[PDB]
Amino acid sequence: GSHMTPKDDEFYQQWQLKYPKLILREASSVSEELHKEVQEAFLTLHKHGCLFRDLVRIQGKDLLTPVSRILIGNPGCTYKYLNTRLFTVPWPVKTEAEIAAACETFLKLNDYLQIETIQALEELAAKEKDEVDIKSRAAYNVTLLNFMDPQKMPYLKEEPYFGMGKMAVSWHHDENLVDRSAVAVYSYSCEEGRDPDIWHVGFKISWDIETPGLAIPLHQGDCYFMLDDLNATHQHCVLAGSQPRFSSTHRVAECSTGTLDYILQRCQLALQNVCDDVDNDDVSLKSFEPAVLKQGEEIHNEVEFEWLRQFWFQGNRYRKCTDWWCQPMAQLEALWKKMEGVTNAVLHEVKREGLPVEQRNEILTAILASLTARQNLRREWHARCQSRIARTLPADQKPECRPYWEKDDASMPLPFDLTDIVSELRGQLLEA
Ligand SMILES: O=C(O)c1ccccc1-c1c2ccc(=O)cc-2oc2cc(O)ccc12
Numbered sequence: 001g002s003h004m005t006p007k008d009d010e011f012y013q014q015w016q017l018k019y020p021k022l023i024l025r026e027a028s029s030v031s032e033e034l035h036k037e038v039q040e041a042f043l044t045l046h047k048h049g050c051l052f053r054d055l056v057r058i059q060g061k062d063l064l065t066p067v068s069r070i071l072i073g074n075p076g077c078t079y080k081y082l083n084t085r086l087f088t089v090p091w092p093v094k095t096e097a098e099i100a101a102a103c104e105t106f107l108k109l110n111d112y113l114q115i116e117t118i119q120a121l122e123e124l125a126a127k128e129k130d131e132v133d134i135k136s137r138a139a140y141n142v143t144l145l146n147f148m149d150p151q152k153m154p155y156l157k158e159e160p161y162f163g164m165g166k167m168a169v170s171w172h173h174d175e176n177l178v179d180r181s182a183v184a185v186y187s188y189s190c191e192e193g194r195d196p197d198i199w200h201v202g203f204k205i206s207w208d209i210e211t212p213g214l215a216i217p218l219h220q221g222d223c224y225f226m227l228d229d230l231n232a233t234h235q236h237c238v239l240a241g242s243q244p245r246f247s248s249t250h251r252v253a254e255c256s257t258g259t260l261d262y263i264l265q266r267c268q269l270a271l272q273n274v275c276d277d278v279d280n281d282d283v284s285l286k287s288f289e290p291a292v293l294k295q296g297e298e299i300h301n302e303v304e305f306e307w308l309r310q311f312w313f314q315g316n317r318y319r320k321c322t323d324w325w326c327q328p329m330a331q332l333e334a335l336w337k338k339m340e341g342v343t344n345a346v347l348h349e350v351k352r353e354g355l356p357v358e359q360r361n362e363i364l365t366a367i368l369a370s371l372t373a374r375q376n377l378r379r380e381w382h383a384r385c386q387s388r389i390a391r392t393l394p395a396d397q398k399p400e401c402r403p404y405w406e407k408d409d410a411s412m413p414l415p416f417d418l419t420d421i422v423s424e425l426r427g428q429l430l431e432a
């Protein structure tokens, strides 16, 4: 395989014909004032230690990301990639003033890039021969900030198909975005084939290493845009230069099951089956109908694994730059603890003498997959909290395996390990 850069005569026509949905707006087109502001914002964020490498999970292995990052965006919004849910430090849509100022800066960059994107999307439609679709596909709700110092990496991976040289980030799609949504990236580098000292973004067609890839040089303050279905039909990578680089990558995160309001509402739905006169350990349920019980136990899993474990696995890195999620997370944990109460109440009822066996077995069938998944996912998460790299990484830089409690812990109604309970319930369902 081979690739094309601006040095190749064929670059220009290949871009024009096979990448009309890829747009580059060079530093020129962006005001010197905005450049100054976002570049300074990058630097304060970096100095206040707001960017971290994430311990992600990909095809079974636990890996530290080469880039350190932070997610900034709409209050209560989250973004899930590589099995890790990132939580926004909020930006002032309708904390220390410095970080607050930085987030404010990245909101107005967001506004600017949003405008640029709509324009580009409008011009693309005109070329191609609705109005609501365009604006919704440009309505960026988060940005993921990235930083890498390549001189800090002992060995960088070679780009494997086109001879593009050292990769800072491997070939991928930006995951979990709204369908056909645009992506906009502000790139900030500190200042035969592609120039090794300069940062590039590379593109290829999915499934395809025969059509030469493009490598687009990125100088200080250059912006690039993936429009419409480009992010889906193509992969991209980031090719490392010799100097450090920041990027701000603005996305329309698909957040239908990914906001604080969404998850609080799911919890409230679950607790509708609980007599709510008073908050104490004496949990009693309004109904034992299979469909209501299954739903309750599913919500229980959702808040435990998608929210609590995700949040705490990331070493409590937030109250550092924002306490915003601290109270929400306390609240979600209290809701989850009530639901541990619910599971116990269901279990009590299963054991009640005078419960017909047919009704018991209908209850078992309703809840068994949820409890099985709860056991398995607890194993998987506990594994993830030790692994190798978690072991290797310093004591300061370790994942927290919360919520977790000992067999002796009398504050919790059920054991953390559900193996016996699951076995027993399963056994009962095979009884004759
Ligand atoms: O880019 C990498 O090689 C990498 C290294 C360690 C951890 C994650 C990644 C990696 C990504 C890192 C950040 C990001 O925004 C996207 C990434 O996508 C990847 C896709 C892969 O197939 C394989 C790897 C990645």
Ligand SMILES: O=C(O)CCC(=O)C(=O)O
Residues within 6 Å of the ligand: 067, 146, 169, 174, 185, 187, 201, 237, 238, 247, 248, 249
């Ligand atoms: O920085 C870029 O150019 C794209 C960002 C990126 O590839 C990522 O880390 O998701």
Ligand SMILES: [Mn+2]
Residues within 6 Å of the ligand: 173, 174, 249
């Ligand atoms: Mn990307």
